[PDB]
């Protein structure tokens, strides 16, 4: 679900869609670790 708060997700990471968060803020916050891998479909 939201890898930060609540329900499953609204959208998936809008650079790959390999991770998902309930709202937008979660994705921007928590992707600090993910930003390093985004762009690669693995
Ligand atoms: Zn969330
Ligand atoms: Zn991504």
């Amino acid at each position: 679900s939201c890898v930060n708060c609540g329900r499953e997700a609204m959208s998936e990471c809008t650079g790959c869609h390999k991770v998902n968060y309930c709202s937008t803020f979660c994705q921007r916050k928590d992707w600090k670790d993910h930003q390093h891998i985004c762009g690669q479909s693995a």
Side-chain angles (χ1 to χ4, degrees):
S1 305
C2 182
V3 188
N4 186 212
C5 346
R7 302 191 296 199
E8 54 177 80
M10 179 180 181
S11 52
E12 298 169 293
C13 179
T14 46
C16 69
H17 303 208
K18 284 181 48 59
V19 292
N20 57 275
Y21 294 88
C22 72
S23 193
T24 307
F25 59 85
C26 335
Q27 180 60 87
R28 142 170 289 145
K29 287 168 54 277
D30 276 66
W31 104 310
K32 291 298 105 61
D33 177 90
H34 174 95
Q35 59 184 89
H36 308 253
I37 68 177
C38 203
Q40 302 163 89
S41 194

